Amino acid sequence: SGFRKMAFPSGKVEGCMVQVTCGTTTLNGLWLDDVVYCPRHVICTSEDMLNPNYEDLLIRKSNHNFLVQAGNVQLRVIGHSMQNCVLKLKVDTANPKTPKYKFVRIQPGQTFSVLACYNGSPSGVYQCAMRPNFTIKGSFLNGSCGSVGFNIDYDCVSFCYMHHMELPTGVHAGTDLEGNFYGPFVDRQTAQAAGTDTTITVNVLAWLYAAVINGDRWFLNRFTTTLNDFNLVAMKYNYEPLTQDHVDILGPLSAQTGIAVLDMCASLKELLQNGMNGRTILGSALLEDEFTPFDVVRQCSGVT
Amino acid sequence: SGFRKMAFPSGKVEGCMVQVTCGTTTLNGLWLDDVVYCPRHVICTSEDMLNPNYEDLLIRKSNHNFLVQAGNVQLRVIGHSMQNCVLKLKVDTANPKTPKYKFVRIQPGQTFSVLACYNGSPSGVYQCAMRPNFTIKGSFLNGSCGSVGFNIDYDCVSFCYMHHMELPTGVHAGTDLEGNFYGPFVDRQTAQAAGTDTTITVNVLAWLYAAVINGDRWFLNRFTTTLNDFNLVAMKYNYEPLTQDHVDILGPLSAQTGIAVLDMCASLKELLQNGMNGRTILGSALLEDEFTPFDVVRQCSGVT
Numbered sequence: 314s315g316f317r318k319m320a321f322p323s324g325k326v327e328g329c330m331v332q333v334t335c336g337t338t339t340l341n342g343l344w345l346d347d348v349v350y351c352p353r354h355v356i357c358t359s360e361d362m363l364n365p366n367y368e369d370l371l372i373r374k375s376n377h378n379f380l381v382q383a384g385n386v387q388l389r390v391i392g393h394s395m396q397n398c399v400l401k402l403k404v405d406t407a408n409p410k411t412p413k414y415k416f417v418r419i420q421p422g423q424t425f426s427v428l429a430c431y432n433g434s435p436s437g438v439y440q441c442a443m444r445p446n447f448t449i450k451g452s453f454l455n456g457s458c459g460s461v462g463f464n465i466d467y468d469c470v471s472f473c474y475m476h477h478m479e480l481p482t483g484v485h486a487g488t489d490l491e492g493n494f495y496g497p498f499v500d501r502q503t504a505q506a507a508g509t510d511t512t513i514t515v516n517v518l519a520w521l522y523a524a525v526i527n528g529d530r531w532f533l534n535r536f537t538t539t540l541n542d543f544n545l546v547a548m549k550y551n552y553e554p555l556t557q558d559h560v561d562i563l564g565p566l567s568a569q570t571g572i573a574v575l576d577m578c579a580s581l582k583e584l585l586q587n588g589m590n591g592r593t594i595l596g597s598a599l600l601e602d603e604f605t606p607f608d609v610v611r612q613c614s615g616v617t
Numbered sequence: 618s619g620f621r622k623m624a625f626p627s628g629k630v631e632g633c634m635v636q637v638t639c640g641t642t643t644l645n646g647l648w649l650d651d652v653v654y655c656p657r658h659v660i661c662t663s664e665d666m667l668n669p670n671y672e673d674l675l676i677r678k679s680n681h682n683f684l685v686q687a688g689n690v691q692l693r694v695i696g697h698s699m700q701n702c703v704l705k706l707k708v709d710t711a712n713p714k715t716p717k718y719k720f721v722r723i724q725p726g727q728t729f730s731v732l733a734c735y736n737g738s739p740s741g742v743y744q745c746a747m748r749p750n751f752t753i754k755g756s757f758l759n760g761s762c763g764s765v766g767f768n769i770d771y772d773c774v775s776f777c778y779m780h781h782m783e784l785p786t787g788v789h790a791g792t793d794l795e796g797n798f799y800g801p802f803v804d805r806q807t808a809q810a811a812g813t814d815t816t817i818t819v820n821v822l823a824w825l826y827a828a829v830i831n832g833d834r835w836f837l838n839r840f841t842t843t844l845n846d847f848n849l850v851a852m853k854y855n856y857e858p859l860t861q862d863h864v865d866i867l868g869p870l871s872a873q874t875g876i877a878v879l880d881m882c883a884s885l886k887e888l889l890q891n892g893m894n895g896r897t898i899l900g901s902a903l904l905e906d907e908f909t910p911f912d913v914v915r916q917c918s919g920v921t
């Protein structure tokens with residue numbers, strides 16, 4: 314019993330973190346096989362970041378300007394290319410600690426672990442979601458860019474996030490491992506506002522199921538609702554519309570608990586309309602939306 | 618910017634997790650050098666757990682009854698001993714992945730990471746505190762005992778917790794790595810109630826500092842207080858009494874933010890007396906008490 318915001322074990326990714334230095338800019342790279350992936354802004358001064366022309370900045374850079382250090386051993390860079398907003402540095406040594414891995418571009422509402430790194434050194438691991446506005450609410454200081462987000466399925470690491478940007482509102486933007494930003498963000502120091510932070514309704518319902526499974530049941534009520542009625546309430550409270558797809562995804566938790574998805578929707582509806590009245594659910598005083606249905610099933614069943 | 622509940626990277630500990638099986642009981646062991654540490658209740662059936670005599674149960678067990686498996690390779694057990702509530706199994710192979718490590722018995726209020734494991738396989742990592750009642754609020758299913766709690770200082774893992782027990786109230790009890798329970802708990806299936814879950818006042822103040830550092834300042838007020846006055850309010854709200862030691866520990870965060878500890882106490886006092894009025898602090902709707910001052914400094918400075 315007990316339900317906790319849980320990151321994947323980080324060991325497989327710790328073995329991939331390197332330090333990348335270009336001139337006086339140091340940040341993190343991801344070493345998989347004989348390629349090191351890092352944010353292209355490694356080639357910028359802080360001055361450059363106001364309006365960088367990355368293609369033009371990169372022409373002044375050679376293989377030997379990319380200093381790549383794995384712990385205390387330097388890697389030889391034998392090639393470099395820009396793919397969207399990442400650099401790929403070809404090194405002469407395959408990372409012996411390369412796990413089975415994929416690159417996946419996640420959807421908003423999907424959760425992942427972040428291994429926060431500075432100078433290619435892991436500092437900590439926490440769990441995030443891709444917000445509906447394509448920001449993440451991370452913990453990133455200067456030197457943390459090139460830190461990556463990942464899921465693990467048994468032995469395969471799916472890398473979904475590389476850290477690039479803080480918005481002036483203190484939220485985070487980054488790319489998949491093909492260097493494409495999540496959302497409309499750019500690697501430029503300009504006016505970039507996050508859109509509405511909508512709540513991930515399917516994840517809240519997943520977490521309400523988690524609560525029931527672990528004994529927190531005070532918020533169960535005698536009511537039911539419809540997708541259309543619930544969605545009127547979701548609209549009012551900046552919740553993502555609930556779809557039949559979301560209902561289908563909640564089916565297994567529905568089945569295990571014997572609480573119909575639409576009944577749990579009616580519970581959530583009452584929580585939205587009435588607040589928690591100073592009570593808590595799984596030790597939270599607000600509605601948690603960074604557990605996916607898959608996260609709840611994983612944690613509630615003990616998958617490794 | 619951003620402040621997140623952050624676990625240590627788990628890689629160094631992942632390399633220490635093994636499966637221990639005795640008869641039909643499987644749980645986790647910790648392999649450091651040529652010793653595997655596991656809960657002594659590995660020798661129990663669920664029936665035994667009502668009133669086990671561990672010394673008597675252990676007499677029926679030989680080295681060859683302790684099946685120890687590191688991934689897919691079996692370790693040869695060449696000796697076994699009971700130390701308090703843990704077994705130490707001597708194996709013929711030093712764990713090649715043994716990190717620099719210490720065994721430390723933490724104090725209530727101290728935080729640590731847990732690598733949740735099943736069958737010697739890591740499932741996830743989350744951050745805990747030793748509660749003032751010597752429980753922890755974990756996420757542990759059957760098969761998770763022998764999972765360990767740890768801090769990392771640069772390269773040295775300090776192991777402080779091994780998981781043993783769920784109380785019927787869904788909170789967790791365990792031992793340090795000398796097999797001594799935190800609090801008055803025993804490895805027996807009996808009536809064991811947790812005492813008062815008091816809030817770790819120094820950790821809440823640490824987290825209020827973290828908030829100010831990261832831009833959440835609405836709860837700062839024009840008031841100050843005294844240790845004695847604050848403690849009257851702490852008493853009323855089941856908060857640990859604040860000591861001069863706690864004030865001294867908050868000094869660096871005091872210094873960095875320029876907010877006197879006693880002024881932040883007065884902010885906390887008003888939060889206790891008035892609640893958050895539907896507002897949030899670092900994305901929480903309650904007062905977080907599982908960041909230590911050391912945790913706030915670590916995360917706010919980017920230590921690795």
Ligand SMILES: *CC(=O)N1CCN(C(C)=O)CC1
Pocket residue numbers: 337338339340354357358359454455456457458459476477478
């Ligand atoms: C020095 C510099 O230009 N930096 C430091 C490394 N980063 C990040 C994003 O952490 C870029 C800015």
Ligand SMILES: *CC(=O)N1CCN(C(C)=O)CC1
Pocket residue numbers: 641642643644658661662663758759760761762763780781782
């Ligand atoms: C089968 C059995 O007796 N078990 C399973 C392993 N554990 C724990 C504590 O996870 C003990 C009970």
